[PDB]
Every structure is written in structure tokens, then in C-alpha cells.
Design a protein around this ligand. Structure first.
Ligand SMILES: [Zn+2]
Lengths: 156, 100, 85, 98, 50, 100, 230, 75, 49, 50, 13
């Protein structure tokens, strides 16, 4: 698969894109004006998440649109991992909650059952690894083939 | 902490800072549109005041960012047109910048 | 939510004490150092519900996992902030 | 009342009896969640934030989707003071530049 | 509580369009409904368009 | 200007306090888009002063109703103007007549 | 089918701009038709050359005031919008106007190229007043038709625009006024023929015979789609 | 049904009953995704349901017994 | 009251009054026409007012 | 400098001797020129027998 | 259109 610094660069850009997508959902908790004064005088120990400059956000959104539109399940796992901030174990347990009994042919004589947490964690990890491997080269090419807009110039 | 006017605006790109100078103020004559940043202003979200314990540990380690919340002056939507005058009044005691 | 009639009448002191959630005993509304509401004031969190969604005043209970509880430290019942009105 | 606009009125004599000329920008601001729904239905936007920014950037596919949405979707033209009941009428809008 | 104040002046240029109000001096106000081209305007015998 | 006026337009344009009328008559020495330097006549000059009036003109000052206020000069270089003549046309004036 | 064909007979220029041009002969009921169609085409879609960008030195925006000139820079841009020029060879030229000293800055002081001919050498642009005053603009002349304003141009400009390019609106069409006349043509065997007298009045740049031939070319090109496809 | 709903009004007998019947038909076309019996000709579901009433396929009792038929065929 | 409020107002009314009014000897009085289409053809050709 | 050539999209034959010859799109201010020219020619210049 | 083209036929390019 990929190496580690490539994975670090891709995970940083995708975490920024996930926090940019998560800053646009409809349902959010409401805080009154007294809560805003308390947060402005003595804020929390942990601050918020960093966002994109909205052009990198739109470009990464178009890249994942071009790649992960044929697979709804992997794209939903990717959104719930990078935007909502949930860990892989939480996504695997939520997949174990709504799991349907599928015909397996690997262990035993092909019994029917509900799949456990271990195979759920394995398929979530495999989907995330394959999704990042499919996103990386076209995202590298899209960041390469983008014109760097410079500062304004003075003609006299 | 005080709100600094500078071009070190986090989580924004060249499409908004192509008209600002190194001081955070739009050039006279730069035709702006709706949504473009005029004056680059950022409010501190952490802290600025320190103790002498934090002074010696600052000489050890360094600083942080502490400039998360951005409240820069942007053009209201629909308004356009070239900047014709920028007048920067300050207070007696605060050190000015290059644009001032 | 599906009511047939809107009945109006006079209010007994027992009914007014049944509406209320705590006796307001101080004129001062909020503080000035940090802007948290006072105790038994005109804006008090223990009487009129919490300020933020699913949070107390001191910061002990801070999630929807503790759905509805009373904080033993500051009295602020952990609910949604819709119950301030 | 939300989803509401206001502008000066002029004369269109090329119209029919059940039509009125809404501007492009004002109707884009009016029909914005409908444009969000058609953008996410046609697969041109994955998320609501991507749909929000595609409308806010005013692309040509957004104008085509707005031309499809506003077709046969009547809006009420109110004028105050509404003395009698004919001061509110519903017209099938036709997008004009202005 | 104010350190410095910056004031930026934008000079918009507002051409007329359909919708802009106009009036004479004798109370005959109105609203521009259309900008009609120079080839469509009525011309007199000399050729100057209205 | 209006082709059909009244003759009241000159009185309104002079006494509105918006143009730059000449205090003392003489010969104009330097016409600019920003200032007018006029040399006074000899008989209207006291021996105490030098006898040079510098009429600065406010160019593109914002008004209350967000319109512009600029003063374009109408007099040419080297032209004898007396006392009470409109030297700089205001926002809506044409050679000392009100032009709305 | 007893039709007759018209020809350009007389082209008399009363002035350098005003130029009356006749058309003879035309059948009964064709003079008004052809006259109105040619008048509408010549007023709408005549290609010409006009000033599009102006870069005065030391000037950022149009609402500034340069030291030395008498006219405001907006008045200079209006006087340069009113400039009439005729580019012969190219479609996009760049002129230069350098002038110092006391005196008016006429249009004849523009340092023209080998294929750019100014038609009005008395078009006063500026009024220099100071002895140490100077002005060095870099006028840009494009080629097109119609009226392209600065708002349409900054909407169609996806590339960056630098600070200094005072964007002048573009009035490309060189025909300002035109009126035809349907008189009685003098033909020795037919008394039911009407001549057409088109009394054009151009900007001094276009040729009147070239204008009529280009207008008829546009009309025939538009009627090709009516002849061919049903 | 695009310009005037007059013949649908004469078919139904009541403006408000026409609004209610066409609303249930348009809800069945928007939520359930049912098959419109008329060619849609790229119209919206409001005009399609109004055109179905204009022809005379949709009535209150007819749509109710059709919904009852689908319900009893579900069970 | 049961009267139409979608009514021509002042400009359509001036145009229709100028249409259906009649002069005495205007242009081409006393012909016979094959119908409304030939009347419209006569006016837009200019042989009759 | 090239114009916009129209494309005939509809001939809605109402009857055996009727037509609605829709012809779109033309340049701004050319539909009136072409329509008035064709109307004057057809009304007062087309040959035939009667 | 043929009649108008034939009338315009003279002064074309
Ligand atoms: Zn607590």
C-alpha cells in the first residue's frame, strides 16, 4: 500500500476537509448569548477544529465526488470517520448494530449468524485503507495541476 | 488580548489575500467585490498576558498560535468598486505599522 | 399538542407555586468578572434551566450521555437550553 | 415570513396573464433549498456544504438547475396595503435578467 | 477599549437599469421599465432618435 | 444645465455654500484639479497681506446620503475674475447654475 | 418576375464625417424596406475601433487627481471614450501619449504607430497648466462591435487585473446618426421606380461604401438560413 | 392544467376538494414514486396530478378504493 | 360585484378606441372585402387606414 | 467578428395552408428587421395570378 | 427570402 509520510499528508488534508464539511450541517446545538459571553471571557481548554480556505474544500469535495460516488457505503464510512470525528471502533460497533445475517463460507460448515465485532473492525479498516489508496493519486494530481494565484501587481 | 491587524490570517487562502499587503490593509485602487477581505483582523482565542514563570518557560520553548477566531472586515454582498481612501487612526500609546 | 379548548381562569397561589421551579431571592441578574448567572437571581440556571445544550455551569456533566440529571455541585439540571423559555 | 423577497415593479407587456418576471439573483436567493435538493439529487454535490458553496459561487449548472426548479412553481405577488383579496395573486414566474 | 480604527471608502458607480426611478420637475415621476436600443427608437425626418 | 430654467438657479448655486466663490477679484495664477491660486487686483489689496488666495477644493468627499462631493474648476488659466464669481463647480453645478 | 437590381451610384461626402450615399434603382415598395433594414443594421452592428484601457502613470484609480492637469481623471477617461480612431492592420494596438509643458493635450499628440490613423486631430483630451507638469498614458485600442461596458468586461475577465488600468467603457460602433429618403428615381422608360438616398453620418473612421456593403453582407448572411432551411 | 384548472373544477365540483384530491395524488407521486398514468412531458408533479384530474382518472373515492386495493394486496 | 377586474386600463383602451372609431372619408372608403384577414392585409400594406 | 447563425427548430403546421415558422436564436434587434422585411415583401411584392 | 437575396445580390463581398 502507501508509505507513511504520504499517508500523513493525505490524512491531514482529509481531516481539514472533514472539518470543513462538518461546519455546514443542519442540526447543531444552540447556545444563547450568555453562553457566548462565558465562552468569550473564559473559553474551554480545547479549541475547535481547523477548516479549509473553501477552495481546497471544494476541490477535495470534487475529488471524492469523482472517486467515491460509485460506492455509497465506503463514502458514508469516510464521512463518518473524517467529518463526524468518530473512531473506527465506534463505526464498527454501529455497523455491528445494523448488521444483517450474510451467508459466510470461511469458518465452519457455512452457518448463518450475525457477524461479530472482529470482522466488522477488519472490513472497516480494509474499506478505509482502500478508500485512501484510491483518493491519493488523483488528489496529488489535482493539487499539482492548479494555478497558484499570486498577489496583485502594480502597473504604474 | 488585543485584536491585531495583520496578514497572518489562518484558514484562508490566496483567493482572499491577493489584494492585501504585508500590513493587512487593502491597496488603494484595488477593485474589490462581495466577500473579499478589506482589513485583515484576527481576535485572539487563547491568552496574551504572562507570568515570569511563563517568561522563563517562553525562553525555553516558544509561543503558540492563539489566533483562531477571525473577524476580518469583509465587503457586504452586492457592494463593489475601487478603494479610494484608507484612513488609519490609532491611539496614543499603541505602536503603528508600516501602512500607518 | 392536540387540544380542544383553551380554558382561562384565575390563578391560586398553590397553582402559581406549582408552575414555578424555585423562589427568586436576589435582584442582581448576572456577574461581571465571568458572565455566569447568579444563584436565586433573575437569570439563575438552577431555576430557569441550563444555559448551553446539555451542560451544567461548572462543566462536570457535558454530554448527552448524561441525559437528564441534577448537578450536585451547582444545582444546574442538565437538559436542553430550550427550557430557558 | 421566510422565503420572501421585495423589489420595485416594472411593466412586462410580452407576458401572459399568469406570468411575472422574477430576477435571476433574487429568485436564486428565494429558491435556495430547492436548488440544494436538485443539486444533491443529480449527483453534482455530495454534501450540504458543497451544495451551499456551489450556489454561493453562482455556477452555470446552478443557473440551469434554477431554470428547471422555477418552472411551474407559482409565487405569490403581495402588495401592501392589501385592501381587498385581489392584492395577493399567484403567478407562474419567468426568469428575467434585471 | 479601542486601539486603532481603519476606514475604507468604496466608490461604486451606479448606471441606470430597468427599475431605476426617474422624474421631471412637474411631478411626472416614473420607473424605467426597459432600455430600448437605438435602432428601435422612433426617429424623425432628420434622423435623430428619441 | 437646464435649457428651460428660471434665473433662480444662479442664486441657489452661489448662496448654497457648496461652491468656491471668489472673495476678492483678480487674475488667476494657477488652476489645478485640487487647488486654485489667484492673484488679487491692486485696488482690492491691503498693504499688510501678500495678496494671494489659495482656494483648496474638496475632491470626492463622502456626503451624508452616500453620494460624492467633488469640486471641478471651471475657470481657465490666466483669466480675470471679479468678486463673487463661481470658480469651482460643485457636485451638481454647471458654470454657476444649479444642474440637478 | 420583372425585378430590377440596385447599384451604388453616387457617394458625396458633404463633410469629413457626414457622407450622403445614394442607391438606384429600386422597385415600388422596396425603397422603404431596404432603407429601414439597412438603417437598423448600420446602427446596430457596425464594427469599429475604440479605446478600451487607459494606463496613466502614477494613477491608481479613476477618482484620483493628478498634479499638473486641470481636468479630473474621470473627465480624461470620458474624453478618451469620445476618441475616434481607425486601426488599419491589427485588431489590438497600444498607443502612447507623452506631453509636457503648458498647453492643451490634443489627440494629434498621440505617438501613433505605422498602421493607426487618428481621424480627429483637434479632440482636446487634457489641459496642462503647470510648467513642470507631465502626462504619459498608455492607451489601448481594441476592435469589436456594440457596447461592452466595464462591468461586463470585469465579469468576463477570469484572469487578474492589475492596479492602474483605468478601465474605459467601449462604444465600438462608428455610426451615430443615419436617415434614408425614398425619392422618385429618374429612369427613361419607367416612372414607377424609387431611388434610395442614405444620408449617413459616421465617426470619420469607416468608409460609407464599405459600411453599406458590410450591412448587405450581414443581411444576406442572415437570409441564407431562410433560403436554405425551409 | 398549466394555464387554467377550469375543466378539472367542472369535473370535481369543488375547488377545495380538488386541492385535497390533487394533494393526495401528488403526495403519492412524490413519496411513494407511483406511476403517472399520463405522459409527464417534463412537468412537475402538481401539474401532472392536475392533468390526471383534467382527464378524469383521479377522484376522492376512486383513489381511496385504489389505495384500499394496494393495501389489501399488501396484506 | 360580479364584474371583471382583469380589464384593459387606459392604454389598451386608448388603442381600441382609436381602432374602432371611424372617420368620414379617410382612405379607401367604400370597398368590399373578403374578410377580416384582407382588412388586416389592407391596413398593413397601407392602401387603407 | 462573427454573428450568430439561427437554426430552424419548429414548423408547426396548423392546417394545410397554415404555419408557425419559429426561428431561434437571432442577434438582439434582428428578429424585428427580418420580420418586417419579409412582411413588406410578402404583402406588396410577391408575384402571382388573380 | 430569395427575392430579398436577389435584390441585395449586387453589393455583397
Ligand atoms: Zn455543574
Amino acid at each position: 500500500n502507501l508509505t507513511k509520510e504520504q499517508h500523513e499528508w493525505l490524512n491531514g488534508w482529509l481531516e481539514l476537509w472533514g472539518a470543513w464539511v462538518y461546519s455546514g450541517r443542519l442540526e447543531k446545538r444552540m447556545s444563547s448569548v450568555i453562553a457566548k459571553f462565558m465562552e468569550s471571557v473564559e473559553p474551554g481548554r480545547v479549541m475547535t477544529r481547523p477548516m479549509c480556505n473553501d477552495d481546497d474544500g471544494m476541490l477535495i469535495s470534487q475529488v471524492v465526488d469523482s472517486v467515491m460516488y460509485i460506492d455509497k457505503k465506503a463514502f458514508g464510512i469516510l464521512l463518518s470517520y473524517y467529518a463526524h470525528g468518530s473512531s473506527k471502533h465506534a463505526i464498527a460497533s454501529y455497523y455491528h448494530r445494523v448488521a444483517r445475517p450474510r451467508k459466510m463460507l470461511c469458518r465452519g460448515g457455512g452457518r448463518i449468524q450475525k457477524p461479530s465485532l472482529a470482522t466488522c473492525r477488519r472490513e472497516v479498516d480494509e474499506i478505509l485503507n482502500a478508500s485512501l489508496f484510491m483518493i491519493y493519486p488523483v488528489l496529488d494530481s489535482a493539487f499539482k495541476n492548479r494555478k497558484r494565484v499570486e498577489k496583485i501587481k502594480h502597473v504604474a | 488580548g488585543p485584536e491585531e491587524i495583520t496578514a497572518d490570517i489562518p484558514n484562508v487562502g490566496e483567493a482572499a489575500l491577493s489584494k492585501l499587503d504585508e500590513s493587512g490593509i487593502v491597496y488603494i485602487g484595488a477593485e474589490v467585490t462581495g466577500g473579499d477581505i478589506l482589513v485583515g483582523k484576527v481576535t485572539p482565542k487563547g491568552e496574551t498576558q504572562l507570568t515570569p514563570e511563563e517568561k522563563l518557560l517562553r525562553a525555553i520553548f516558544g509561543e503558540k498560535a492563539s489566533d483562531v477566531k477571525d473577524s476580518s472586515l469583509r465587503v457586504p454582498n452586492g457592494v463593489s468598486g475601487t478603494v479610494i481612501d484608507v484612513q488609519v487612526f490609532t491611539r496614543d500609546g499603541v505602536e503603528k505599522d508600516k501602512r500607518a | 399538542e392536540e387540544f380542544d379548548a383553551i380554558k382561562i381562569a384565575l390563578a391560586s397561589p398553590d397553582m402559581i407555586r406549582s408552575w414555578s421551579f424555585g423562589e427568586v431571592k436576589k435582584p442582581e441578574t448576572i456577574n461581571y468578572r465571568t458572565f455566569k448567572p447568579e444563584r436565586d437571581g433573575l437569570f439563575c440556571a438552577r431555576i430557569f434551566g441550563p444555559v448551553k445544550d446539555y451542560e451544567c455551569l461548572c462543566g462536570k456533566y457535558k454530554r448527552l450521555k448524561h441525559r437528564g440529571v441534577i448537578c450536585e455541585k451547582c444545582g444546574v439540571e442538565v437538559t436542553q437550553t430550550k427550557v430557558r423559555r | 415570513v421566510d422565503y420572501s423577497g421585495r423589489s420595485v415593479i416594472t411593466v412586462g407587456p410580452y407576458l401572459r396573464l399568469h406570468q411575472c418576471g422574477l430576477p435571476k439573483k433574487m429568485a436564486l436567493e428565494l429558491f435556495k433549498p430547492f436548488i440544494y435538493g436538485k443539486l444533491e439529487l443529480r449527483g453534482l454535490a455530495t454534501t450540504i456544504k458543497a451544495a451551499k458553496k456551489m450556489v454561493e459561487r453562482e455556477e452555470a449548472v446552478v443557473w440551469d438547475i434554477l431554470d428547471e426548479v422555477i418552472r411551474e412553481h407559482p409565487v405569490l405577488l403581495n402588495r401592501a396595503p392589501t385592501l381587498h383579496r385581489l392584492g395577493i395573486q399567484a403567478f407562474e414566474p419567468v426568469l428575467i435578467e434585471g | 477599549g479601542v486601539l486603532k480604527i481603519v476606514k475604507v471608502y468604496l466608490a461604486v458607480k451606479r448606471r441606470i437599469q430597468p427599475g431605476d426611478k426617474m422624474a421631471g420637475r412637474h411631478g411626472n415621476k416614473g420607473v424605467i421599465s426597459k432600455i430600448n436600443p437605438i435602432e428601435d427608437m422612433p426617429y424623425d425626418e432628420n434622423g435623430t432618435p428619441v | 444645465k437646464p435649457l428651460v430654467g428660471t434665473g433662480m438657479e444662479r442664486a441657489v448655486a452661489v448662496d448654497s455654500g457648496v461652491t468656491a466663490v471668489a472673495k476678492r477679484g483678480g487674475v488667476v495664477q494657477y488652476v489645478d484639479a485640487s487647488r486654485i491660486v489667484i492673484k488679487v487686483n491692486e485696488d482690492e489689496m491691503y498693504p499688510g497681506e501678500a495678496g494671494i488666495d489659495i482656494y483648496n477644493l474638496t475632491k470626492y468627499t463622502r456626503s451624508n446620503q452616500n453620494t460624492c462631493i467633488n469640486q471641478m474648476p471651471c475657470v481657465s488659466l490666466g483669466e480675470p475674475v471679479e468678486r463673487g464669481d463661481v470658480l469651482a463647480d460643485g457636485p451638481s453645478t454647471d458654470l454657476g447654475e444649479l444642474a440637478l | 418576375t420583372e425585378f430590377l437590381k440596385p447599384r451604388l451610384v453616387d457617394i458625396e461626402q458633404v463633410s469629413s464625417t457626414h457622407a450622403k450615399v445614394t442607391l438606384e434603382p429600386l422597385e415600388r415598395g422596396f425603397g422603404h424596406t431596404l432603407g429601414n433594414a439597412l438603417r437598423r443594421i448600420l446602427l446596430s452592428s457596425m464594427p469599429g475601433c475604440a479605446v478600451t484601457e487607459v494606463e496613466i502613470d502614477g494613477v491608481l484609480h479613476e477618482y484620483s487627481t493628478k498634479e499638473g492637469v486641470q481636468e479630473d481623471i474621470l473627465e480624461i477617461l470620458l474624453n478618451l471614450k469620445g476618441l475616434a480612431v481607425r486601426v488599419q492592420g491589427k485588431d489590438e494596438v497600444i498607443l502612447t501619449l507623452n506631453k509636457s509643458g503648458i498647453g492643451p493635450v490634443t489627440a494629434a499628440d498621440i505617438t501613433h504607430d505605422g498602421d493607426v490613423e487618428i481621424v480627429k486631430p483637434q479632440h482636446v483630451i487634457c489641459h496642462l497648466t503647470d510648467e513642470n507638469a507631465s502626462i504619459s498614458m498608455r492607451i489601448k485600442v481594441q476592435r469589436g462591435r456594440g457596447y461592452v461596458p466595464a462591468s461586463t468586461r470585469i465579469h468576463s475577465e477570469e484572469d487578474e487585473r492589475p492596479i492602474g488600468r483605468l478601465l474605459v467603457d467601449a462604444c465600438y460602433s462608428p455610426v451615430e446618426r443615419i436617415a434614408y429618403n425614398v425619392e422618385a428615381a429618374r429612369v427613361e422608360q419607367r416612372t414607377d421606380l424609387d431611388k434610395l438616398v442614405i444620408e449617413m453620418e459616421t465617426n470619420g473612421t469607416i468608409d460609407p461604401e464599405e459600411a453599406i456593403r458590410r450591412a448587405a453582407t450581414i443581411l444576406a448572411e442572415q437570409l441564407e438560413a431562410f433560403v436554405d432551411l425551409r | 392544467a398549466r394555464v387554467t384548472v377550469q375543466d378539472a373544477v367542472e369535473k370535481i365540483g369543488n375547488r377545495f376538494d380538488l386541492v385535497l384530491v390533487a394533494a393526495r395524488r401528488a403526495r403519492q407521486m412524490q413519496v411513494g414514486g407511483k406511476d403517472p398514468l399520463v405522459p409527464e412531458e417534463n412537468d412537475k408533479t402538481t401539474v401532472i396530478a392536475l392533468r390526471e384530474i383534467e382527464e378524469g382518472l383521479i377522484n376522492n373515492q376512486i383513489l381511496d378504493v385504489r389505495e384500499r386495493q394496494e393495501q389489501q394486496e399488501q396484506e | 360585484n360580479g364584474e371583471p377586474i382583469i380589464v384593459p386600463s387606459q392604454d389598451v383602451v386608448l388603442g381600441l378606441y382609436y381602432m374602432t372609431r371611424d372617420c368620414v372619408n379617410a382612405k379607401g372608403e367604400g370597398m368590399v372585402l373578403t374578410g377580416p384577414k384582407e382588412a388586416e392585409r389592407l391596413y398593413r400594406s397601407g392602401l387603407a387606414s
